[PDB]
Design an enzyme around this catalytic site. Structure first.
Site, PDB file in Angstrom:
ATOM      1  N   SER A 134      81.726   8.519 -11.586  1.00 61.35           N
ATOM      2  CA  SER A 134      80.646   7.399 -12.035  1.00 61.35           C
ATOM      3  C   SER A 134      80.061   8.953 -12.452  1.00 61.35           C
ATOM      4  CB  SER A 134      79.865   6.778 -10.775  1.00 61.35           C
ATOM      5  OG  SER A 134      78.142   7.128 -11.111  1.00 61.35           O
ATOM      6  N   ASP A 186      85.071  -2.288 -15.464  1.00 63.78           N
ATOM      7  CA  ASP A 186      83.883  -1.478 -15.084  1.00 63.78           C
ATOM      8  C   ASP A 186      83.067  -1.214 -16.516  1.00 63.78           C
ATOM      9  OD1 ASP A 186      82.542   0.296 -13.589  1.00 63.78           O
ATOM     10  OD2 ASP A 186      84.111   1.702 -13.311  1.00 63.78           O
ATOM     11  N   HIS A 199      84.078  -1.319 -10.785  1.00 66.35           N
ATOM     12  CA  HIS A 199      84.095  -0.246 -10.474  1.00 66.35           C
ATOM     13  C   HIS A 199      84.307   0.728  -9.526  1.00 66.35           C
ATOM     14  CE1 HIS A 199      81.867   3.593 -11.660  1.00 66.35           C
ATOM     15  NE2 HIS A 199      80.347   3.795 -10.801  1.00 66.35           N
TER      16      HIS A 199
END
Length: 220
Positions: A134, A186, A199
């Site tokens: 991320s 995602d 995700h």
């Protein structure tokens, strides 16, 4: 360790899906702490350098310096694939803040570049691997963009999960030594800010990510 299925099943009970990172932040943090506590998974690592060393930058709102969702699984799979070769894991001590996610986390990249160079100073014989999830993948990208060729030549592999800059290479680095894992659906990999189930499930890719790294950290 729980099985991957029991872990994902716990995540589906505790993680917020469909919200923006801004709206979901505190529930993400709480959910990850709940999962970490239930399963006895560490969300902080500060090891000395190993034979192999991984520097891992966690995702926005993840607790600790490695979170629970992905890092710990990647480290476990890597150590298993390395056998007796000791893996040292170091989390990247940055805020993983909502604001830095929305701005690009550039200064965090610079600080990670200094963290990398300092590991290489202290541990010239380690096989250094960078990992991100991320926002942490943004930090790795930014660190690479701020580093010289000599430092980058000393990095054995880079593994990015849920890359917000998906499609961009790791700057100043051999693309054949990079693995980027971005799940279909995602939103973060599309440059978005919404936290959806794909995700949250990158623990499933830990074995494959570890297998990618092993040949890149050989002494032979």
């Amino acid at each position: 360790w729980p099985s991957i299925n029991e872990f994902l099943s716990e995540l589906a009970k505790v993680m917020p899906i469909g919200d923006t990172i801004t709206a979901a932040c505190d529930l993400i943090s709480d959910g990850e702490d709940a999962a970490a506590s239930l399963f006895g998974i560490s969300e902080t690592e500060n090891d000395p350098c190993g034979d192999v060393t991984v520097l891992f930058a966690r995702g926005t709102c993840d607790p600790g310096n490695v979170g629970v969702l992905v890092g710990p699984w990647f480290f476990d799979s890597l150590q298993t694939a390395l056998g007796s070769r000791t893996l040292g894991v170091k989390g990247v001590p940055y805020p993983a803040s909502v604001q830095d996610f929305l701005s690009g986390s550039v200064q965090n990249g610079i600080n990670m570049a200094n963290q990398i160079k300092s590991v290489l100073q202290s541990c010239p014989n380690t096989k250094l691997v960078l990992g991100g999830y991320s926002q942490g993948s943004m930090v790795v990208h930014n660190a690479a963009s701020n580093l010289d060729a000599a430092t980058m030549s000393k990095i054995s592999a880079v593994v990015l999960f849920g890359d917000p800059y998906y499609g961009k290479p790791v700057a100043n680095f051999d693309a054949a030594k990079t693995l980027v894992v971005c799940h279909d659906g995602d939103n973060i990999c599309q440059g978005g800010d919404i936290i959806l189930l794909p995700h949250l499930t990158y623990a499933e890719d830990a074995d494959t990510a570890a297998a990618f790294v092993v040949p890149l950290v050989s002494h032979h």
